[PDB]
Amino acid sequence: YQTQVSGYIITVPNETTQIRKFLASNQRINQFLFQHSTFRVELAPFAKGGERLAFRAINGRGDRIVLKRFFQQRPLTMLLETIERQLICIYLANIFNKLNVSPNKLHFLPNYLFIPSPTKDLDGKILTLEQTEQAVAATCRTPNFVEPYLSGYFIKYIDNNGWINESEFHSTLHAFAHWTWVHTKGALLICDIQGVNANNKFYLTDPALHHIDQNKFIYSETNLGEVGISQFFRTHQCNAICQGLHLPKHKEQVLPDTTKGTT
Ligand SMILES: [Zn+2]
Numbered sequence: 001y002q003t004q005v006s007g008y009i010i011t012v013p014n015e016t017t018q019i020r021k022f023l024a025s026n027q028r029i030n031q032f033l034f035q036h037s038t039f040r041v042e043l044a045p046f047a048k049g050g051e052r053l054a055f056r057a058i059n060g061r062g063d064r065i066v067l068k069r070f071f072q073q074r075p076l077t078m079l080l081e082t083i084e085r086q087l088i089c090i091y092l093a094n095i096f097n098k099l100n101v102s103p104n105k106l107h108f109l110p111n112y113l114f115i116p117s118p119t120k121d122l123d124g125k126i127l128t129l130e131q132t133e134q135a136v137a138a139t140c141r142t143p144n145f146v147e148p149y150l151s152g153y154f155i156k157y158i159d160n161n162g163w164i165n166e167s168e169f170h171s172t173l174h175a176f177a178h179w180t181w182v183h184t185k186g187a188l189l190i191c192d193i194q195g196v197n198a199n200n201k202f203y204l205t206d207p208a209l210h211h212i213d214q215n216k217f218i219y220s221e222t223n224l225g226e227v228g229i230s231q232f233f234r235t236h237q238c239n240a241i242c243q244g245l246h247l248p249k250h251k252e253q254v255l256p257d258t259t260k261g262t263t
Pocket of ligand 1: 178237238
């Protein structure tokens with residue numbers, strides 16, 4: 001069974017600039033673009049786990065998407081952490097890919113929000129966080145997460161606590177994680193790197209972000225702060241991609257460099 005649902009897709013306008021600002025200063029994203037949209041959505045969830053339900057849908061531009069939601073009500077600001085995290089990961093991977101130090105390219109799935117609406121008057125408009133809260137409230141429903149559909153064999157390559165998948169080792173992914181800490185001057189590290197490998201491409205989903213500021217990602221269960229950063233580096237070996245990038249090492253690193261895998 002399926003029905004039509006109409007409402008607003010909610011994204012962040014000028015992502016790069018917003019994210020650059022969020023990282024550098026300490027100011028949360030306060031600008032959200034609303035775009036009217038109609039989805040065809042399955043009534044029955046095809047999967048659940050990691051604390052949340054998943055529904056197949058078609059975005060009417062015909063693309064296959066997945067609508068996700070936590071089991072019960074959550075405040076907008078909690079859900080926005082997932083979005084802010086994903087946007088950081090996309091920002092970082094885009095720069096990382098632009099370095100062209102590896103044939104393998106990293107692509108985190110876009111994540112946005114969807115709320116149903118009978119009306120379309122906010123179409124194309126940019127709203128503050130508070131105005132977005134009011135648009136959400138008017139619906140009186142928890143927004144859904146939306147992400148493109150991803151098929152293939154899903155692998156967890158690195159977790160958020162120093163664990164490394166051995167058989168499916170990719171030096172590109174490990175160097176990326178180290179690099180995220182270097183690029184953000186020690187402030188955060190991206191891990192829980194997991195998704196699908198095909199054609200020199202990693203399609204990555206549900207990452208974790210450790211931040212040294214105890215007030216930055218307060219709802220995230222996967223953010224272990226400075227300890228999670230230390231945990232990554234205790235088992236990290238700088239690889240040929242790290243070396244080619246001349247990444248400075250974390251003072252917890254003790255293991256010797258390795259040159260298995262890419263480059
Ligand atoms: Zn390294």
